[PDB]
Design a protein around this ligand. Sequence first.
Ligand SMILES: CCCCCCCCCCCCCCCCCC(=O)OC[C@H](COP(=O)([O-])OC[C@H](O)COP(=O)([O-])OC[C@H](COC(=O)CCCCCCCCCCCCCCCCC)OC(=O)CCCCCCCCCCCCCCCCC)OC(=O)CCCCCCCCCCCCCCCCC
Lengths: 140, 105, 347, 169, 120, 171, 80, 98, 110
Amino acid sequence: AKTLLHQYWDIPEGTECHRKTYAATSIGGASGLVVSAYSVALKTPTSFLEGVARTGRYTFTAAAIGAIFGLTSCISAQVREKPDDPLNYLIGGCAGGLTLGARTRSYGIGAAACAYMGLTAALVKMGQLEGWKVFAEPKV
Amino acid sequence: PFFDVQKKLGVDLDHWMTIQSAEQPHRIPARCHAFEKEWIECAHGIGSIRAEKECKIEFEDFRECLLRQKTMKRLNAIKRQRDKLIKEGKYTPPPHHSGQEDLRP
Amino acid sequence: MNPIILIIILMTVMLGTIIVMISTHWLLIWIGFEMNMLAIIPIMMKKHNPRATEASTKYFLTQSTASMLLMMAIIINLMFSGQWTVMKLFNPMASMLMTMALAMKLGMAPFHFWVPEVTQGIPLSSGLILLTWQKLAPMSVLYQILPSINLDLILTLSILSITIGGWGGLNQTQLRKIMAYSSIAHMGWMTAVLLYNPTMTLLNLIIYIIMTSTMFTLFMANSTTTTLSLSHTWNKAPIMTILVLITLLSMGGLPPLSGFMPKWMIIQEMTKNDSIILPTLMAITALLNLYFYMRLTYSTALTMFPSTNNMKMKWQFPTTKRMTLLPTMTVLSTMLLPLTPILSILE
Amino acid sequence: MMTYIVFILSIIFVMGFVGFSSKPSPIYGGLGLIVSGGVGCGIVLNFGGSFLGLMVFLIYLGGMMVVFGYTTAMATEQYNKVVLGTFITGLLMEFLMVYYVLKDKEVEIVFKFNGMGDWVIYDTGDSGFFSEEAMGIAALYSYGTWLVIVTGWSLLIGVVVIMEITRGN
Amino acid sequence: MMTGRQARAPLQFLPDEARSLPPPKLTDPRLAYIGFLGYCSGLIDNAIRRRPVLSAGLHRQFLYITSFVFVGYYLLKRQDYMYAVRDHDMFSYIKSHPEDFPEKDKKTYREVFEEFHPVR
Amino acid sequence: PGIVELPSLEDLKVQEVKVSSSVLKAAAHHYGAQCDKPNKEFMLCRWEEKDPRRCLEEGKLVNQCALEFFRQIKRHCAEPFTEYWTCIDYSGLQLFRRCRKEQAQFDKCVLDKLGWVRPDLGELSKVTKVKTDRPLPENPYHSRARPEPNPEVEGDLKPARHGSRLFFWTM
Amino acid sequence: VAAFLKNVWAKEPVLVASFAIAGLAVILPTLSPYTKYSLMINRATPYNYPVPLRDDGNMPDVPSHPQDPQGPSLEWLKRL
Amino acid sequence: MSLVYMNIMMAFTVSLTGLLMYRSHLMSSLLCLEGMMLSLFILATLMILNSHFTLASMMPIILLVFAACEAALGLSLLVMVSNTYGTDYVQNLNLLQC
Amino acid sequence: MNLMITLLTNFTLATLLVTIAFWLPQLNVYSEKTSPDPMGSARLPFSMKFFLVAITFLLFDLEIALLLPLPWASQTTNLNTMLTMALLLIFLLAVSLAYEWTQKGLEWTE
Ligand SMILES: CCCCCCCCCCCCCCCCCC(=O)OC[C@H](COP(=O)([O-])OC[C@H](O)COP(=O)([O-])OC[C@H](COC(=O)CCCCCCCCCCCCCCCCC)OC(=O)CCCCCCCCCCCCCCCCC)OC(=O)CCCCCCCCCCCCCCCCC
């Protein structure tokens, strides 16, 4: 799922909304399947149906987070006409946080996820802009 | 921490099984003795970073000696085209590739 | 156990680690790990209760799985190189399998799931051997294969170890599980700097072994395995509360202590390589380890939990336990930061 | 067909592992691992590993799996859908690998794999009046001195360790 | 980092060229700090066995001080040796690769133009 | 890469020694005694060149000198040689020890009519010297140029300038 | 030491025979005049082809023919 | 590479995933572990015979002996668990959750 | 190939005789039998001593596996080292036997 993040970043901002939304949906779906796999690993469900219900719940939750993140970010960059602007991913991360709060059916978790995921998406945009490396290659 | 006790004391605890080109019982050569000797004598002493780029050709010849991937791929190509031309009727084998010729010695 | 048999078995544990450290052939690496596990199993079953048998079974299964993945990495190296020198591996699949095997032998996350169980199942001295001596051989093999270790894999193992060893110790009251999650977080710190500068990896390993040996020696000298029995130490021996205070503040990396020494140097070697977000999030996650260290210092040194009446009998006896190197390890785990440039002896 | 025989044995070998990786019971699991040891021994024997193959029989099967079956007989008191489904799953995965590499003469699971018979990669010479595998095992006493020391010390320690942990005191 | 330098002569604590270096003085502040660590170890050893801390076991405290000064002297010799090897390899690499280390023209501030940013 | 250079089928035509292995084993010691020089020239060329394509002509000399060996048996001593290799040929391991009287008759007839002495125990396993006129291969492995080593260490070791230079430490 | 020997030879003669045979097997190859000949025979056995030397012009101890006088001889093995 | 090596690696991964997905018995886990060891023996043996690397022919025997010693140790652990609970079920080995 | 033919013939003769022994009296229609052990219904008691002799077999069999290349090992030219390591492996098998002896491991199946 290295190519998933690349095909997310390959489209310029505010240009092609549908495939950006689909790419963030697919990245969220992959992350939700990872969380679902470890969740049914370390915590045994009571049945196969309960297990696939947990899997579908977490996968749909994270996919909806990614979908509404990419949609809100691209629509904000379209109506503001500012592609290299981290306020767009700030609003998109807060929209994904409200999405996570609506999936968890709670407003405090929604405001917390809005704030922290909006700051996280803003930091990811700034790292895309100034070239911040998290897995930095050894140079010295 | 590789505490190099074997070079400090001058003992050979495990260097003898380390490469195929080492001293063997009854001087039995490995099937890739020459290629490994060339790759080691290329890459000796110059460090691994320089060895990955200044000795890549001998390493590729030695890996292709070990695994024979290019040789098996070439034999796949020749045998596949051969059976395709047998199927098309455009080729026939010789008598020495059918077993009718009373082999050499 | 017979003391002669105990001495021969502990020398065999040491001999397994030495054969991993000094050998130039991958078969002898695998043999040294096999000898180390085979000899350390009775050290874990020293007291013969079902918890030690469960801990030794879990330890056997994880280390046996790691040994088989290690031998598969060795055999794939033999496929793609035809030789056996203990150096860089000549296939990224063999590199990934050997990194997985050594992450299992170190108990780094997400292969951490045996470390807090097994350490809880065994005595404190065998837990000391498991958390100090059993790191030296896999970190030596990681030291020698770092030209072939994938960066993303070892950094994922490092950050996952630091975060899981941070959040794991926050729920604990048993001291052995606290030391085990501390172990997981510190192994994350050691492998996060492995591809950047392995001298700081050796530094963090030595300072960690000194601080861990200090804490287990204090736990043995006071016969304490839970937090709540460590809280009776001020009414029994008030010096030991000061010792666990300064050593737990040192393991949290608070300056001017010695355990501030590795992680600072680790940050000092990760910003030279233009990684800023990664040592920052590592150092922020180390505050969790500091938090449950502070929980233990509140329970032990900085407050006085109530004792019982029978403690008055234990006032009439001094500790006859051989507290081997405990003042030395206490000094070397707290007051060592002014000698921070000594680390060049590890180059 | 007989030019592919080692490959064919390897197929049975993989099927044998799906015999016991599905884990029906430790006794049928032991039986599947015994049959797997026999066919993997046959794979070894068809390259010229005569001594190593008879070590698979004598030491792995006749020595070690006897102790596995013996210990299993002293447990699991004498009188599934998961085992059946996992068995047919591993069967179908292996025969899909077979079908792919036999119709394509190339496959790639993790590495690239040729689809011809494995006879192609042998050597076209003689070893004279010895087996090379036999002389390389005989050099355990001439060249393998450190290996003999650490192996015998591990076996002696193994005797001591088994007598410690099985004593219960 | 320097793993190839100390590999032709393996497991030497102090090589022969370390004798070309001036040894740490016996009045080294680092060595006196290690002696202070030995004295603190003697005090902690009297404290954990409930001895009189300053009075009991002066032979034992003196062997603590002696052992830490003795080990730390060799540790400081190796430290100075490794930083000397570090600088020696640095300077030989700078001398051996002038195409990578150009002598940069130091401009004076009469030519150097910097943007002024007023604090108001 | 390049095209491998195979010799023609005409370069591989030679008059073959079409006898069985018991014929060769019965005549083996006298073959090593009499056909010494071209055999050892060929095997010297074979271990030095490490290429059979550079060793064809000497090989043909081997196949020339073996045949002249057998004709010189076939002219003079066909009966004791036939009676000896038949008895060698009976055994499934082809033992010399089962056939000592036919060996003695063959050695008697050969030493009388041809003067050949059978080599003693130890003689045919000697390492001998061979005087050839072909040149020594200067690069028998066809090795290309080796990389230059890294520059060694030289110069007297001076102290570290201002010590460790670690952040604030002056030593 | 003589009463111990008769005592263990009356009680446990299997172990006395065992340690006696083992002690002879340990010490006796270092006392035998024939242990040299085992090594001499194992190095006289020609598993490999005796690869010839290029005659440079000065090797008086290397023969030109197997029936030449110089070279290693095995009359010691034919006689023994 | 060679087609038999595919099957020996795939057998190692099958015995791996059997060893990484327990059902109930510790003996089935030990059998999966020894299937892993057997596949390693076969793969090392086929390479060492295939390469004519003479001195590594003693390597699989060593790979046998140590690991079979390891197997013996594992059997003893099973027996001690079987001397505690009567069976070798891995769900009886859960005291270290707390 | 001749070995595979021989193994197949031996297995086929064995399976044939087993099928004959299992299905020749099944042709008889004797009667249906109802038939409603020293132990009554008790669970199989584990004995530690049978497991100890089985593991002792396995460990000495691994030592035997080390000892098996000796007739080929005697052909070496490093005979002093070969003889030292051969006597050392038989001595370590003897030391394993002595430790099994003197710590009562060979008792009640001596
Ligand atoms: C004719 C033949 C014989 C000739 C003899 C000539 C000499 C005659 C006199 C004999 C005695 C000489 C003593 C050594 C020379 C002077 C060293 C010195 O003062 O360095 C200043 C040193 C650097 O200042 P400076 O003005 O740039 O240099 C002046 C000289 O050029 C310094 O020279 P330098 O530039 O070459 O110094 C090299 C370098 C200079 O330093 C540096 O390059 C900077 C790095 C220094 C370490 C910073 C670490 C920061 C993080 C940890 C903080 C720990 C907590 C602080 C203390 C807590 C309480 C224990 O030193 C180090 O890196 C070593 C570390 C510091 C050890 C200093 C010697 C201590 C011996 C006694 C220890 C007693 C306990 C002391 C307190 C423990 C902490 C040290 O000052 C500090 O680092 C501040 C802290 C004070 C250090 C200790 C002062 C020594 C005297 C202590 C007496 C009072 C003891 C009270 C009882 C125990 C404590 C409660």
